Design a protein around this ligand. Structure first.
Ligand SMILES: N[C@@H](CCCC[NH3+])C(=O)O
Ligand SMILES: N[C@@H](CCCC[NH3+])C(=O)O
Ligand SMILES: N[C@@H](CCCC[NH3+])C(=O)O
Ligand SMILES: N[C@@H](CCCC[NH3+])C(=O)O
Ligand SMILES: N[C@@H](CCCC[NH3+])C(=O)O
Lengths: 233, 233, 233, 233, 234
């Protein structure tokens, strides 16, 4: 690769990709992508894309790599190759205040009179249909649209990857929601690239091992997952 | 690959693959293969094959994968590729009664007046050739035939993969054989696929890493290496 | 109604209604009926009554509503109308220490030696007969008489609505018995009024949802089901 | 009410009600009445009835409830009260083998050239008028009789409640018809009772809630909507 | 469950539920609902504009069939009429004069007896403000619109009322002069009332309500009145 590293993501998975107040795209994966560019001695470009355009975009060479906090699922892994996992994740729940009472398991929210909302075409959806099966399930176009349904009284509860939930609790959720943080799925996230390229994978993996033993990774992880400065966009 | 997942294996290797009383082939690898096929959204077609016909069956494109309790050796691995190890194993023995007495190690048993038996052309035959300088070694077409040879007055001791020993011990060698259980080799077991498809490898390694963290693999480990339920066929 | 709302209950079920110290009756249900009366602009009158005279007491205008932890069952529903459920409950078991080990459902405790005990003529009794075939079962007049035999040594297990088993646990059971938390049935508890009054229902259903979105329900709930300050009765 | 529960239904709406080989009527709606009569303490008498006579059979007191896959509408609700819905269904198409190709929405089958058919005076005919402007509409006496006009030459496509179609496909259709399963409407079906009984409502509505939270509704759902045993009939 | 016409009592001037068009017909989210409901029953709509303290008794007295006036389901009222499952959920909000919102985190920063607070007489807000406000002057007026004029006039500092009123008011006149403190302070389910002893008609209404929530009808009327601004050319 010469010139520039084109990375496609979709903004809105806090704290991985979000849109600035200035409209600039920032986050863990964005910093991850600057490092990669640097370590490759090459220019970074981001291409923003909707979740559903990510894999075809990659497969079609709209970009070279995906770094969107994407679950290494066996389905998707048939269309692209995944680098090794750089963070490990699972789905928790955000609930309206009050229905959290006496819940010992997620399983007793799997009730027919309850409405569960996530975003369409994502891990949590697939989790939701595997996990629940009683509760009504509705899906939406964004993480934001979806938690709004429960915030505004339209839904009872919201499911998503755990770090979106804890980012959210910090920025808006503390007062009005409750986070049931017990993880419900084992979801490694890796970067995806298109098949037929083992040389890239070699490079990507080593470059992952480096930052994980460099102290570089742990800084970024501190920045986006423990620290709270970032929250003023 | 679309349609079906063809898996070559050779039954005989308790608890990985054997055939039941009904005539169907079942066991650890089978449940793995079934799980694998489901993850690719595909049908499963086992292709039972004699051992010597497994690699060339594979390289010959008669099936896509070996799942036979195959050992990742440097010799084989010149001919095919292996996924990361799904289980680690090692060679042990069964001796007839009275034999187990006085022994401190394998070295005590490596004597000329004794005959050692094992399946021809297999992992054990190689450790046997390496480990034992003084003892007669005679090989057979199936593990069962090899054991029989010491269930009779014919051989003194049988060597094989340790897990087969522990299962046969529970199956038939209860009163008769004695199990010296000191692992004598380091034997990593792995799925093999033909060379020059690194994408399938990527998909295989990410899948093996799921079932070790899912609980899936764990549920299946118990089933076949602890449960004792499966002895009824 | 006029002048007084008359409530029909039997003190015993904890933490719903219990008599103590001063000989006053108190609990979640009482606190509920208290808010109900302020809402109507009436004065509360509590009419403590043995279980088996609640429904007859109701049909006979001994009192106007039954708020003492009652299951909305189809048998009882033939005889009175239920407001929509105010809480959802379920059978759990208190057992002696030792009994909990390796037990992987209530079902592996259904044995002709073991003795299940309960209060007579209550939802707990009917579930006892439905689930447990083999276990000797004995019945007593109160919840206390029944758990006694278990604490003391005569019977050895106890079955009742879960909220009780945790409440007992927090007062007297913590060193002594083991609580298999798992939910054995689905048991909605509702207020019961006599038939032929759809207006009082309409009113009762709206009152229920007010306190549910009011925070009022929630306060009472913490105060009785989580708060440990009350057990100082 | 005591003695028996009389239940009015029209056989043919697979898999809710249909006449079996011997000629007794079965299905999801019968098993559901069978649960009602057990819980009610009472015997069960099914009163089969032509559809345009059910509402008048109820009001007339020919039976006590209509469980028939009846859609809840405002028109109907003027004459009879409806319990809450027990299932939500949607209208869908059964078209001749071949003319499924190209199509993207139901609208491209709305050509003056094509003949659409369904049963007379039933919520499928109304959606059909509502949704089909051009195509010639013909109405018959029974679902079975209307489809029969696509199975032979006469008509082109068939409109009815999705479960009917999934059922018809698994029973006869696979090689003959094509099923576009995009639900075109949203219709909640409900049980009807004669107006004037608020107590039977309260009963019926709690009963529906039990079985939906119990496992019994789900038993009966897998049974008729999924399993396929039922066809041997 | 009747023949002839469906008669609906309402009090115009709770924007955007009910208002006078100025050609003098009453229009609003409630009227469109009342219009849908009447069609579904195959019957005619008559609106019976009524002043607020006369809605319930008019219903009991059989002057009309149902009240669709954005009325709060309350235990005290529910004693006298029956309510249908609520159809929209609302809370009280505050409209204040310019600047007066700076450095305020909650409603509590506004209790000063210095401050004067106004609303309409005998209405959800009036009872809420008496609960919530302990120090502030509370004055009352026959109409929502007479009430806000006092803060617009600078004879009072802030207006309290159902939140959807405030946003519609902010759009028409308030945008330059007042500021909407839009934190919801009550939990106020809104339902149609009818007289007691009629379970059938309740059955009918509850199922009609479920129908328009799942139709798209409800959402449509909702957008039309509560979100988009077109309705404002009275
Ligand atoms: N990691 C999840 C979240 C998607 C985030 C959508 N912006 C997935 O792979 O679907
Ligand atoms: N790992 C042993 C197992 C052989 C089993 C023969 N059925 C090998 O590689 O030869
Ligand atoms: N839920 C129980 C109540 C416990 C009995 C209280 N003394 C029942 O309805 O049978
Ligand atoms: N669900 C529709 C169709 C039932 C068809 C009866 N054979 C209705 O309520 O009319
Ligand atoms: N929700 C308010 C409506 C105000 C009506 C004013 N015309 C109430 O029920 O009091």
């Amino acid at each position: 690769l010469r010139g520039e590293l084109r990375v496609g993501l979709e903004p809105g998975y806090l704290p991985f990709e979000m849109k600035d107040k200035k409209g600039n795209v920032i986050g863990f994966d964005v910093d991850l992508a600057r490092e990669m560019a640097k370590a490759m001695g090459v220019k970074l470009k981001l291409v923003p894309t909707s979740w559903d355009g990510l894999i075809p975009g990659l497969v079609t060479e709209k970009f070279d790599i995906i770094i969107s906090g994407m679950t290494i699922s066996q389905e998707r892994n048939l269309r692209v190759n995944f680098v090794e996992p750089y963070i490990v994740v699972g789905q928790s729940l955000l609930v309206k205040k009050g229905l959290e009472k006496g819940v010992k398991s997620y399983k007793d929210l799997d009730k027919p009179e309850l409405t569960l909302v996530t975003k369409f075409g994502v891990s949590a959806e697939y989790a939701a249909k595997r996990l629940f099966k009683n509760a009504k399930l509705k899906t939406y176009d964004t993480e934001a649209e979806a938690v709004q349904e429960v915030l505004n009284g339209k839904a009872d509860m919201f499911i998503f990857d755990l770090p979106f939930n804890v980012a959210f609790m910090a920025q808006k959720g503390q007062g009005y929601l409750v986070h049931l943080d017990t993880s419900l799925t084992y979801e490694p996230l890796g970067w995806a690239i298109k098949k037929g390229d083992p040389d890239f994978l070699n490079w990507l993996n080593h470059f992952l091992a480096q930052i994980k033993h460099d102290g570089s990774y742990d800084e970024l992880y501190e920045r986006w997952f423990v620290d709270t400065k970032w929250l003023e966009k």
